[PDB]
Amino acid sequence: SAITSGQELLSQARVLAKYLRDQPEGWLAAHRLMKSVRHDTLHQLPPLSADGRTRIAPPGPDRRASLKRLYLQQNWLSLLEQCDDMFARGASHLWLDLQWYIHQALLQTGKENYAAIIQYDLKGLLLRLPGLETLAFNDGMPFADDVTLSWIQQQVM
Amino acid sequence: SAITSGQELLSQARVLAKYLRDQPEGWLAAHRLMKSVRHDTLHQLPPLSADGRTRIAPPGPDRRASLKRLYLQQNWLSLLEQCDDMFARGASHLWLDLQWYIHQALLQTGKENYAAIIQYDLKGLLLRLPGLETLAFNDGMPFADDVTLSWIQQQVM
Numbered sequence: 001s002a003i004t005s006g007q008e009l010l011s012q013a014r015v016l017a018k019y020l021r022d023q024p025e026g027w028l029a030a031h032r033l034m035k036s037v038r039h040d041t042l043h044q045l046p047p048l049s050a051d052g053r054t055r056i057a058p059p060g061p062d063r064r065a066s067l068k069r070l071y072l073q074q075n076w077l078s079l080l081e082q083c084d085d086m087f088a089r090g091a092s093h094l095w096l097d098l099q100w101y102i103h104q105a106l107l108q109t110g111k112e113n114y115a116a117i118i119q120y121d122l123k124g125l126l127l128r129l130p131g132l133e134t135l136a137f138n139d140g141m142p143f144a145d146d147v148t149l150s151w152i153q154q155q156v157m
Numbered sequence: 158s159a160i161t162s163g164q165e166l167l168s169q170a171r172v173l174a175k176y177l178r179d180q181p182e183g184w185l186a187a188h189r190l191m192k193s194v195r196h197d198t199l200h201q202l203p204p205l206s207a208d209g210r211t212r213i214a215p216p217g218p219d220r221r222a223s224l225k226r227l228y229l230q231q232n233w234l235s236l237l238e239q240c241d242d243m244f245a246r247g248a249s250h251l252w253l254d255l256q257w258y259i260h261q262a263l264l265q266t267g268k269e270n271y272a273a274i275i276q277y278d279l280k281g282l283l284l285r286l287p288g289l290e291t292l293a294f295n296d297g298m299p300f301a302d303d304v305t306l307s308w309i310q311q312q313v314m
Contacts, residue, residue, distance in 0.1 A: 002176065003176075003179065006180070009173065009176055009177070012173055013173060016166065016169055016170060016173060019159065019160075019166055020166070020194075020198070022160065023163070023198075025200055026197075026198065028193075028197045029193055029194065029197035029198050032193040032197050033190060033193045033194060033197075035193075036185075036186055036189040036190045036192075036193055037177075037186065037190060040183075040185045040186035040189050040190075041177070041180075041183065041186050043182055113284050113285050116281065116284060117281040117284070117285075120277040120278075120280065120281055121277075123277065124273065124274040124277055127270050127273060127274070128270050128274075
């Protein structure tokens, strides 16, 4: 709960973000608080890269199939809410596709100004950690697939 | 400490940010956590605007003269540390000049990638609240002066 146990900072930040989400139109605040506590804490290029793959475990087939279902079902509000839980429960969530899912849901929900911020937030992270966009997980699953990497290199820069 | 007392969220966020700042190279994380908890919580154009001036009180001559001294003394590291305390103890800190001070210190400290993020962060806020850049406090003191507003309209957009 102090100095060591960064794990405990993440859990204390989670309860702080839970508060903000419950408040009127406080999604962004709640969302962006996790982005700063997870992305702005990573200053190392790789963590570590083995023979191609990073030692970082993929998101999990259960939860990643659950998001494809919500996208197909065009249920933006639930997809948006489920992406945040996924970002909190994983590996700094370098599953960059999650950001694309949020972006798509924000465009389809009409919140265009919010969707622009998401792009800027990601641009900043990738400015700091260059090769991050192009890396892959344990199983070989990329952090960013064809559809999302396309969006990164020509829409977010 | 829950639902009501957003004041108590700010104090709990402050202790969370204090942790991050103490960690190696965790300034940004600490900084950006305050930006999300203070700026991303404001969705209203003005709060409220009277006959020109907003009902929002200025930063305080004591602390704003203290920052000019540090800028003149070119003590970037202390200015950067003092701007964060100022952002936490004030009115959502719409004292936009604070962001310019941080930006200048980040450029002079060499952390160019960090300084770019600061600009993007501000761009997002001003995208959400348009007229914010051009408003003024109780005494008539603008949120952004000539030197900083110049930086906003042609460097941050």
